[PDB]
PDB file of C-alpha atoms in Angstrom:
ATOM      1  CA  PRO A   6      13.932   8.857  -9.636  1.00  0.00           C
ATOM      2  CA  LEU A   7      11.934   8.911  -6.392  1.00  0.00           C
ATOM      3  CA  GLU A   8       9.320   6.524  -7.825  1.00  0.00           C
ATOM      4  CA  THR A   9      11.627   3.533  -7.346  1.00  0.00           C
ATOM      5  CA  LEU A  10      11.966   4.449  -3.658  1.00  0.00           C
ATOM      6  CA  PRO A  11       9.490   2.630  -1.370  1.00  0.00           C
ATOM      7  CA  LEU A  12       7.857   4.295   1.635  1.00  0.00           C
ATOM      8  CA  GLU A  13      10.710   3.284   3.952  1.00  0.00           C
ATOM      9  CA  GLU A  14      13.275   4.976   1.695  1.00  0.00           C
ATOM     10  CA  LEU A  15      11.191   8.118   1.122  1.00  0.00           C
ATOM     11  CA  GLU A  16      10.910   8.733   4.869  1.00  0.00           C
ATOM     12  CA  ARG A  17      14.658   8.198   5.291  1.00  0.00           C
ATOM     13  CA  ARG A  18      15.677  10.608   2.521  1.00  0.00           C
ATOM     14  CA  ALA A  19      13.130  13.239   3.578  1.00  0.00           C
ATOM     15  CA  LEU A  20      14.335  13.100   7.188  1.00  0.00           C
ATOM     16  CA  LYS A  21      17.929  13.431   5.970  1.00  0.00           C
ATOM     17  CA  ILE A  22      17.366  16.522   3.801  1.00  0.00           C
ATOM     18  CA  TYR A  23      15.468  18.088   6.706  1.00  0.00           C
ATOM     19  CA  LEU A  24      18.265  17.341   9.184  1.00  0.00           C
ATOM     20  CA  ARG A  25      20.879  18.512   6.667  1.00  0.00           C
ATOM     21  CA  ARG A  26      18.947  21.802   6.380  1.00  0.00           C
ATOM     22  CA  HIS A  27      18.019  22.366  10.043  1.00  0.00           C
ATOM     23  CA  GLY A  28      20.366  21.416  12.867  1.00  0.00           C
ATOM     24  CA  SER A  29      24.138  20.869  12.788  1.00  0.00           C
ATOM     25  CA  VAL A  30      25.109  17.180  12.696  1.00  0.00           C
ATOM     26  CA  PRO A  31      28.001  15.506  10.815  1.00  0.00           C
ATOM     27  CA  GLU A  32      26.745  14.903   7.292  1.00  0.00           C
ATOM     28  CA  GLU A  33      28.333  11.455   6.961  1.00  0.00           C
ATOM     29  CA  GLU A  34      27.056  10.466  10.427  1.00  0.00           C
ATOM     30  CA  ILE A  35      23.440  11.191   9.444  1.00  0.00           C
ATOM     31  CA  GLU A  36      23.179   8.312   6.962  1.00  0.00           C
ATOM     32  CA  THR A  37      24.229   5.684   9.528  1.00  0.00           C
ATOM     33  CA  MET A  38      21.587   6.626  12.109  1.00  0.00           C
ATOM     34  CA  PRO A  39      18.529   4.386  12.554  1.00  0.00           C
ATOM     35  CA  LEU A  40      15.267   5.740  11.185  1.00  0.00           C
ATOM     36  CA  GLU A  41      13.765   5.625  14.684  1.00  0.00           C
ATOM     37  CA  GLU A  42      16.434   8.116  15.763  1.00  0.00           C
ATOM     38  CA  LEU A  43      16.157  10.208  12.584  1.00  0.00           C
ATOM     39  CA  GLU A  44      12.598  11.216  13.485  1.00  0.00           C
ATOM     40  CA  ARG A  45      13.542  11.921  17.106  1.00  0.00           C
ATOM     41  CA  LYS A  46      16.313  14.351  16.149  1.00  0.00           C
ATOM     42  CA  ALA A  47      14.342  15.804  13.228  1.00  0.00           C
ATOM     43  CA  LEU A  48      11.261  16.484  15.355  1.00  0.00           C
ATOM     44  CA  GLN A  49      13.545  17.762  18.116  1.00  0.00           C
ATOM     45  CA  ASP A  50      14.758  20.397  15.653  1.00  0.00           C
ATOM     46  CA  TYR A  51      11.120  21.149  14.807  1.00  0.00           C
ATOM     47  CA  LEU A  52       9.910  21.560  18.395  1.00  0.00           C
ATOM     48  CA  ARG A  53      12.987  23.581  19.383  1.00  0.00           C
ATOM     49  CA  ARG A  54      12.139  26.221  16.749  1.00  0.00           C
ATOM     50  CA  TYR A  55       8.354  26.545  16.477  1.00  0.00           C
ATOM     51  CA  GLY A  56       7.487  25.928  20.136  1.00  0.00           C
ATOM     52  CA  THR A  57      10.041  26.598  22.878  1.00  0.00           C
ATOM     53  CA  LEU A  58       9.188  23.861  25.393  1.00  0.00           C
ATOM     54  CA  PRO A  59      11.450  22.739  28.264  1.00  0.00           C
ATOM     55  CA  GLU A  60      14.781  22.104  26.575  1.00  0.00           C
ATOM     56  CA  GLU A  61      15.477  18.768  28.297  1.00  0.00           C
ATOM     57  CA  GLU A  62      11.953  17.358  28.119  1.00  0.00           C
ATOM     58  CA  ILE A  63      12.273  17.422  24.316  1.00  0.00           C
ATOM     59  CA  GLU A  64      15.414  15.306  24.740  1.00  0.00           C
ATOM     60  CA  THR A  65      13.714  12.723  26.988  1.00  0.00           C
ATOM     61  CA  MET A  66      10.085  12.704  25.811  1.00  0.00           C
ATOM     62  CA  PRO A  67       8.889   9.566  23.996  1.00  0.00           C
ATOM     63  CA  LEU A  68       8.738   9.527  20.217  1.00  0.00           C
ATOM     64  CA  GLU A  69       4.928   9.474  20.315  1.00  0.00           C
ATOM     65  CA  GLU A  70       4.889  12.720  22.312  1.00  0.00           C
ATOM     66  CA  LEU A  71       7.497  14.474  20.158  1.00  0.00           C
ATOM     67  CA  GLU A  72       5.376  13.683  17.097  1.00  0.00           C
ATOM     68  CA  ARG A  73       2.102  14.736  18.733  1.00  0.00           C
ATOM     69  CA  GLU A  74       3.343  18.217  19.644  1.00  0.00           C
ATOM     70  CA  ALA A  75       5.011  18.593  16.240  1.00  0.00           C
ATOM     71  CA  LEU A  76       1.681  17.820  14.564  1.00  0.00           C
ATOM     72  CA  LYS A  77      -0.170  20.086  17.005  1.00  0.00           C
ATOM     73  CA  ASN A  78       2.072  23.051  16.189  1.00  0.00           C
ATOM     74  CA  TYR A  79       1.608  22.358  12.474  1.00  0.00           C
ATOM     75  CA  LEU A  80      -2.171  22.705  12.789  1.00  0.00           C
ATOM     76  CA  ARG A  81      -1.986  25.805  15.002  1.00  0.00           C
ATOM     77  CA  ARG A  82       0.137  27.806  12.551  1.00  0.00           C
ATOM     78  CA  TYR A  83      -1.159  26.342   9.263  1.00  0.00           C
ATOM     79  CA  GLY A  84      -4.762  25.461  10.105  1.00  0.00           C
ATOM     80  CA  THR A  85      -7.930  27.297  11.066  1.00  0.00           C
ATOM     81  CA  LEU A  86      -9.475  24.295  12.814  1.00  0.00           C
ATOM     82  CA  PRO A  87      -9.984  25.236  16.487  1.00  0.00           C
ATOM     83  CA  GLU A  88      -7.290  24.610  19.084  1.00  0.00           C
ATOM     84  CA  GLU A  89      -9.783  22.737  21.300  1.00  0.00           C
ATOM     85  CA  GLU A  90     -10.162  19.407  19.494  1.00  0.00           C
ATOM     86  CA  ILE A  91      -6.473  19.437  18.503  1.00  0.00           C
ATOM     87  CA  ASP A  92      -5.650  18.011  21.937  1.00  0.00           C
ATOM     88  CA  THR A  93      -8.468  15.443  21.754  1.00  0.00           C
ATOM     89  CA  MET A  94      -7.897  14.529  18.095  1.00  0.00           C
ATOM     90  CA  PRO A  95      -6.296  11.063  17.869  1.00  0.00           C
ATOM     91  CA  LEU A  96      -2.772  10.576  16.573  1.00  0.00           C
ATOM     92  CA  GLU A  97      -4.204   8.762  13.546  1.00  0.00           C
ATOM     93  CA  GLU A  98      -6.169  11.938  12.742  1.00  0.00           C
ATOM     94  CA  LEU A  99      -3.571  14.599  13.584  1.00  0.00           C
ATOM     95  CA  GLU A 100      -1.327  13.002  10.956  1.00  0.00           C
ATOM     96  CA  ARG A 101      -4.174  12.861   8.426  1.00  0.00           C
ATOM     97  CA  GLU A 102      -5.108  16.525   8.859  1.00  0.00           C
ATOM     98  CA  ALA A 103      -1.457  17.624   8.812  1.00  0.00           C
ATOM     99  CA  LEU A 104      -0.951  15.853   5.468  1.00  0.00           C
ATOM    100  CA  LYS A 105      -4.111  17.230   3.848  1.00  0.00           C
ATOM    101  CA  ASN A 106      -3.000  20.657   5.077  1.00  0.00           C
ATOM    102  CA  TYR A 107       0.409  20.025   3.501  1.00  0.00           C
ATOM    103  CA  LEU A 108      -0.828  18.645   0.174  1.00  0.00           C
ATOM    104  CA  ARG A 109      -3.240  21.556  -0.310  1.00  0.00           C
ATOM    105  CA  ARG A 110      -0.557  24.214   0.233  1.00  0.00           C
ATOM    106  CA  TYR A 111       2.587  22.849  -1.441  1.00  0.00           C
ATOM    107  CA  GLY A 112       0.748  20.363  -3.660  1.00  0.00           C
ATOM    108  CA  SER A 113      -0.942  20.462  -7.071  1.00  0.00           C
ATOM    109  CA  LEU A 114      -3.580  17.921  -5.997  1.00  0.00           C
ATOM    110  CA  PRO A 115      -7.270  18.838  -5.717  1.00  0.00           C
ATOM    111  CA  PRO A 116      -8.859  18.486  -2.262  1.00  0.00           C
ATOM    112  CA  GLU A 117     -11.267  15.920  -3.724  1.00  0.00           C
ATOM    113  CA  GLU A 118      -8.303  13.536  -3.818  1.00  0.00           C
ATOM    114  CA  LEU A 119      -6.794  14.604  -0.487  1.00  0.00           C
ATOM    115  CA  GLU A 120     -10.070  13.730   1.256  1.00  0.00           C
ATOM    116  CA  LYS A 121     -10.350  10.339  -0.489  1.00  0.00           C
ATOM    117  CA  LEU A 122      -6.669   9.347  -0.424  1.00  0.00           C
ATOM    118  CA  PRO A 123      -5.903   6.984   2.484  1.00  0.00           C
ATOM    119  CA  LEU A 124      -3.388   7.789   5.195  1.00  0.00           C
ATOM    120  CA  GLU A 125      -0.802   5.391   3.761  1.00  0.00           C
ATOM    121  CA  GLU A 126      -0.999   7.101   0.367  1.00  0.00           C
ATOM    122  CA  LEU A 127      -1.261  10.548   1.974  1.00  0.00           C
ATOM    123  CA  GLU A 128       2.132   9.832   3.550  1.00  0.00           C
ATOM    124  CA  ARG A 129       3.554   8.865   0.151  1.00  0.00           C
ATOM    125  CA  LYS A 130       2.597  11.951  -1.873  1.00  0.00           C
ATOM    126  CA  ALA A 131       3.566  14.331   0.940  1.00  0.00           C
ATOM    127  CA  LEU A 132       7.003  12.706   1.201  1.00  0.00           C
ATOM    128  CA  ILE A 133       7.614  12.644  -2.560  1.00  0.00           C
ATOM    129  CA  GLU A 134       6.572  16.305  -2.739  1.00  0.00           C
ATOM    130  CA  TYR A 135       8.966  17.393   0.022  1.00  0.00           C
ATOM    131  CA  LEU A 136      11.892  15.712  -1.752  1.00  0.00           C
ATOM    132  CA  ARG A 137      11.153  17.110  -5.225  1.00  0.00           C
ATOM    133  CA  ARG A 138      11.177  20.611  -3.688  1.00  0.00           C
ATOM    134  CA  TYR A 139      14.070  20.384  -1.195  1.00  0.00           C
ATOM    135  CA  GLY A 140      16.297  17.689  -2.706  1.00  0.00           C
ATOM    136  CA  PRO A 141      17.539  15.581  -5.661  1.00  0.00           C
TER     137      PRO A 141
ATOM    138  CA  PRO B   6     -13.394  -7.335   0.002  1.00  0.00           C
ATOM    139  CA  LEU B   7     -10.449  -6.976   2.392  1.00  0.00           C
ATOM    140  CA  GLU B   8      -8.175  -5.765  -0.418  1.00  0.00           C
ATOM    141  CA  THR B   9     -10.381  -2.692  -0.933  1.00  0.00           C
ATOM    142  CA  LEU B  10      -9.864  -1.352   2.599  1.00  0.00           C
ATOM    143  CA  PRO B  11      -6.866   0.879   3.402  1.00  0.00           C
ATOM    144  CA  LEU B  12      -3.914  -0.110   5.567  1.00  0.00           C
ATOM    145  CA  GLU B  13      -5.228   2.030   8.437  1.00  0.00           C
ATOM    146  CA  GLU B  14      -8.501   0.085   8.565  1.00  0.00           C
ATOM    147  CA  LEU B  15      -6.777  -3.294   8.144  1.00  0.00           C
ATOM    148  CA  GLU B  16      -4.719  -2.629  11.272  1.00  0.00           C
ATOM    149  CA  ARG B  17      -7.827  -1.285  13.022  1.00  0.00           C
ATOM    150  CA  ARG B  18      -9.641  -4.570  12.383  1.00  0.00           C
ATOM    151  CA  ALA B  19      -6.572  -6.705  13.123  1.00  0.00           C
ATOM    152  CA  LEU B  20      -5.996  -5.031  16.488  1.00  0.00           C
ATOM    153  CA  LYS B  21      -9.734  -5.306  17.222  1.00  0.00           C
ATOM    154  CA  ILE B  22     -10.017  -9.087  16.808  1.00  0.00           C
ATOM    155  CA  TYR B  23      -6.804  -9.465  18.822  1.00  0.00           C
ATOM    156  CA  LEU B  24      -8.227  -7.499  21.758  1.00  0.00           C
ATOM    157  CA  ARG B  25     -11.458  -9.524  21.648  1.00  0.00           C
ATOM    158  CA  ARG B  26      -9.637 -12.874  21.858  1.00  0.00           C
ATOM    159  CA  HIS B  27      -6.395 -12.315  23.764  1.00  0.00           C
ATOM    160  CA  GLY B  28      -6.727 -10.524  27.087  1.00  0.00           C
ATOM    161  CA  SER B  29      -9.645  -8.556  28.495  1.00  0.00           C
ATOM    162  CA  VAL B  30     -10.786  -5.377  26.741  1.00  0.00           C
ATOM    163  CA  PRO B  31     -14.418  -4.174  26.914  1.00  0.00           C
ATOM    164  CA  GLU B  32     -16.068  -4.804  23.555  1.00  0.00           C
ATOM    165  CA  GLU B  33     -18.247  -1.707  24.049  1.00  0.00           C
ATOM    166  CA  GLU B  34     -15.575   0.119  21.993  1.00  0.00           C
ATOM    167  CA  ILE B  35     -15.827  -1.647  18.629  1.00  0.00           C
ATOM    168  CA  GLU B  36     -14.335   1.390  16.877  1.00  0.00           C
ATOM    169  CA  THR B  37     -14.459   4.266  19.396  1.00  0.00           C
ATOM    170  CA  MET B  38     -10.920   3.793  20.714  1.00  0.00           C
ATOM    171  CA  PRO B  39      -8.183   5.451  18.633  1.00  0.00           C
ATOM    172  CA  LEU B  40      -5.603   3.497  16.677  1.00  0.00           C
ATOM    173  CA  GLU B  41      -2.886   4.731  19.046  1.00  0.00           C
ATOM    174  CA  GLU B  42      -4.741   3.136  21.961  1.00  0.00           C
ATOM    175  CA  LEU B  43      -5.338  -0.094  20.024  1.00  0.00           C
ATOM    176  CA  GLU B  44      -1.613  -0.512  19.350  1.00  0.00           C
ATOM    177  CA  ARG B  45      -0.619   0.254  22.943  1.00  0.00           C
ATOM    178  CA  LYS B  46      -2.893  -2.024  24.983  1.00  0.00           C
ATOM    179  CA  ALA B  47      -2.473  -4.858  22.469  1.00  0.00           C
ATOM    180  CA  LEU B  48       1.312  -4.593  22.814  1.00  0.00           C
ATOM    181  CA  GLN B  49       1.323  -4.696  26.624  1.00  0.00           C
ATOM    182  CA  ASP B  50      -0.860  -7.811  26.424  1.00  0.00           C
ATOM    183  CA  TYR B  51       1.619  -9.548  24.120  1.00  0.00           C
ATOM    184  CA  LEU B  52       4.532  -8.378  26.281  1.00  0.00           C
ATOM    185  CA  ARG B  53       2.730  -9.946  29.273  1.00  0.00           C
ATOM    186  CA  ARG B  54       1.430 -13.297  28.001  1.00  0.00           C
ATOM    187  CA  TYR B  55       4.373 -14.080  25.698  1.00  0.00           C
ATOM    188  CA  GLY B  56       7.175 -12.566  27.784  1.00  0.00           C
ATOM    189  CA  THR B  57       8.551 -11.883  31.254  1.00  0.00           C
ATOM    190  CA  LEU B  58       8.544  -8.075  31.445  1.00  0.00           C
ATOM    191  CA  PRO B  59       7.736  -6.021  34.570  1.00  0.00           C
ATOM    192  CA  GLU B  60       4.105  -5.020  35.009  1.00  0.00           C
ATOM    193  CA  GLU B  61       4.775  -1.532  36.408  1.00  0.00           C
ATOM    194  CA  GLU B  62       7.223  -0.919  33.522  1.00  0.00           C
ATOM    195  CA  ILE B  63       5.205  -1.676  30.378  1.00  0.00           C
ATOM    196  CA  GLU B  64       2.244   0.412  31.579  1.00  0.00           C
ATOM    197  CA  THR B  65       4.579   3.434  31.469  1.00  0.00           C
ATOM    198  CA  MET B  66       6.576   2.201  28.465  1.00  0.00           C
ATOM    199  CA  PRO B  67       6.471   4.362  25.312  1.00  0.00           C
ATOM    200  CA  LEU B  68       5.077   2.980  22.076  1.00  0.00           C
ATOM    201  CA  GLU B  69       8.416   2.967  20.235  1.00  0.00           C
ATOM    202  CA  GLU B  70       9.825   0.674  22.954  1.00  0.00           C
ATOM    203  CA  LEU B  71       6.734  -1.467  23.557  1.00  0.00           C
ATOM    204  CA  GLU B  72       6.862  -2.411  19.873  1.00  0.00           C
ATOM    205  CA  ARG B  73      10.645  -2.842  20.021  1.00  0.00           C
ATOM    206  CA  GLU B  74      10.394  -5.453  22.778  1.00  0.00           C
ATOM    207  CA  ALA B  75       7.418  -7.186  21.144  1.00  0.00           C
ATOM    208  CA  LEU B  76       9.495  -7.752  18.007  1.00  0.00           C
ATOM    209  CA  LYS B  77      12.517  -8.759  20.091  1.00  0.00           C
ATOM    210  CA  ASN B  78      10.266 -11.306  21.808  1.00  0.00           C
ATOM    211  CA  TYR B  79       8.481 -12.444  18.641  1.00  0.00           C
ATOM    212  CA  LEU B  80      11.789 -12.911  16.814  1.00  0.00           C
ATOM    213  CA  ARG B  81      13.144 -15.061  19.655  1.00  0.00           C
ATOM    214  CA  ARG B  82      10.479 -17.768  19.926  1.00  0.00           C
ATOM    215  CA  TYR B  83       9.710 -17.877  16.173  1.00  0.00           C
ATOM    216  CA  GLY B  84      12.971 -16.834  14.479  1.00  0.00           C
ATOM    217  CA  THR B  85      16.208 -18.391  13.257  1.00  0.00           C
ATOM    218  CA  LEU B  86      18.640 -15.460  13.370  1.00  0.00           C
ATOM    219  CA  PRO B  87      20.810 -15.443  16.522  1.00  0.00           C
ATOM    220  CA  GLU B  88      19.923 -13.471  19.631  1.00  0.00           C
ATOM    221  CA  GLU B  89      22.914 -11.114  19.360  1.00  0.00           C
ATOM    222  CA  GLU B  90      21.400  -9.614  16.199  1.00  0.00           C
ATOM    223  CA  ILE B  91      18.050  -8.871  17.871  1.00  0.00           C
ATOM    224  CA  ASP B  92      19.474  -6.168  20.144  1.00  0.00           C
ATOM    225  CA  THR B  93      21.467  -4.575  17.302  1.00  0.00           C
ATOM    226  CA  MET B  94      18.857  -4.792  14.535  1.00  0.00           C
ATOM    227  CA  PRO B  95      17.007  -1.452  14.242  1.00  0.00           C
ATOM    228  CA  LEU B  96      13.277  -1.112  14.781  1.00  0.00           C
ATOM    229  CA  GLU B  97      12.569  -0.811  11.049  1.00  0.00           C
ATOM    230  CA  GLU B  98      14.468  -4.059  10.464  1.00  0.00           C
ATOM    231  CA  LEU B  99      12.771  -5.728  13.436  1.00  0.00           C
ATOM    232  CA  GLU B 100       9.411  -5.102  11.748  1.00  0.00           C
ATOM    233  CA  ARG B 101      10.614  -6.475   8.407  1.00  0.00           C
ATOM    234  CA  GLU B 102      11.983  -9.788   9.686  1.00  0.00           C
ATOM    235  CA  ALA B 103       8.965 -10.185  11.982  1.00  0.00           C
ATOM    236  CA  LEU B 104       6.535  -9.677   9.097  1.00  0.00           C
ATOM    237  CA  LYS B 105       8.404 -12.111   6.843  1.00  0.00           C
ATOM    238  CA  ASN B 106       8.513 -14.699   9.637  1.00  0.00           C
ATOM    239  CA  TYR B 107       4.739 -14.419  10.049  1.00  0.00           C
ATOM    240  CA  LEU B 108       4.190 -14.623   6.278  1.00  0.00           C
ATOM    241  CA  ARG B 109       5.996 -17.986   6.256  1.00  0.00           C
ATOM    242  CA  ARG B 110       4.142 -19.861   9.013  1.00  0.00           C
ATOM    243  CA  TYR B 111       0.784 -18.663   7.624  1.00  0.00           C
ATOM    244  CA  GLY B 112       1.596 -17.729   4.042  1.00  0.00           C
ATOM    245  CA  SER B 113       0.957 -18.997   0.519  1.00  0.00           C
ATOM    246  CA  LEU B 114       3.366 -16.500  -1.055  1.00  0.00           C
ATOM    247  CA  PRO B 115       6.708 -17.849  -2.306  1.00  0.00           C
ATOM    248  CA  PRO B 116       9.621 -16.797  -0.072  1.00  0.00           C
ATOM    249  CA  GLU B 117      11.425 -15.239  -3.045  1.00  0.00           C
ATOM    250  CA  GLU B 118       8.396 -12.977  -3.497  1.00  0.00           C
ATOM    251  CA  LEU B 119       8.133 -12.395   0.263  1.00  0.00           C
ATOM    252  CA  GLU B 120      11.468 -10.592  -0.002  1.00  0.00           C
ATOM    253  CA  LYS B 121      10.433  -8.730  -3.170  1.00  0.00           C
ATOM    254  CA  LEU B 122       7.705  -6.936  -1.210  1.00  0.00           C
ATOM    255  CA  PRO B 123       8.739  -3.737   0.610  1.00  0.00           C
ATOM    256  CA  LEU B 124       7.965  -3.149   4.277  1.00  0.00           C
ATOM    257  CA  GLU B 125       4.810  -1.164   3.473  1.00  0.00           C
ATOM    258  CA  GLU B 126       3.320  -4.149   1.617  1.00  0.00           C
ATOM    259  CA  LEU B 127       4.538  -6.897   3.966  1.00  0.00           C
ATOM    260  CA  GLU B 128       2.306  -5.320   6.620  1.00  0.00           C
ATOM    261  CA  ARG B 129      -0.773  -5.428   4.372  1.00  0.00           C
ATOM    262  CA  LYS B 130      -0.403  -9.152   3.684  1.00  0.00           C
ATOM    263  CA  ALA B 131       0.364  -9.914   7.334  1.00  0.00           C
ATOM    264  CA  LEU B 132      -2.725  -7.971   8.418  1.00  0.00           C
ATOM    265  CA  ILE B 133      -4.844  -9.539   5.667  1.00  0.00           C
ATOM    266  CA  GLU B 134      -3.550 -13.059   6.324  1.00  0.00           C
ATOM    267  CA  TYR B 135      -4.296 -12.404  10.003  1.00  0.00           C
ATOM    268  CA  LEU B 136      -7.900 -11.324   9.410  1.00  0.00           C
ATOM    269  CA  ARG B 137      -8.696 -14.273   7.134  1.00  0.00           C
ATOM    270  CA  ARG B 138      -7.646 -16.578   9.994  1.00  0.00           C
ATOM    271  CA  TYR B 139      -9.395 -14.908  12.948  1.00  0.00           C
ATOM    272  CA  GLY B 140     -12.147 -12.852  11.301  1.00  0.00           C
ATOM    273  CA  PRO B 141     -15.611 -13.813  10.001  1.00  0.00           C
TER     274      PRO B 141
END
């Protein structure tokens, strides 16, 4: 049933299931939040667990910084690529590597595709995979 | 031609021609700057030439709020919906109504099909219709 969902609905549902699994927030008050805020509170749950930073910076950091550190942690624990160029790797590339890393582990797709699939389609398959494993 | 390139490269070209025409950016970085830097500096330029925002505020503004104000500004001078909605409409809905508004002034698609497209595809046409107007 997830095929009929466009990319804006897949990101919403995936962020919901994640926030319904990690973090305690009213379940009926999750649906009414804007998608900009869904990522901020989802990636706040991520940073609070895998990398104990200052507790109030994570509340006030911009959304581009919350995502950058969340992607950085993902490559440190799930990737052998050196820590050095993780800081210098652009945001457009941290996302790409974090999705190829995700689709190789929890995905039945050969790496020949994951290196040729664009970033927009890499976001699709990784979001449809997360839902078919952790949700309806 | 342009339809064969991915959505990441479309935006990379679109933001490149914009920097070369509007404002002053050294053209010695045809593709060396990251996509995160292309979006940022091109947004502060639009927030400066087409708006009345503080200088010392946008240079420290995050990306999720630079884009928010750019759509709030773009929807004002080119939109029909009232101003009260602009502050309440979420960021994901600000992008949708901004992309549809652009695809009308410079669009050969029928408006009934403009709605049929999801937000992921409205961006492709807007970027492609932009490059056919300002690109070689």
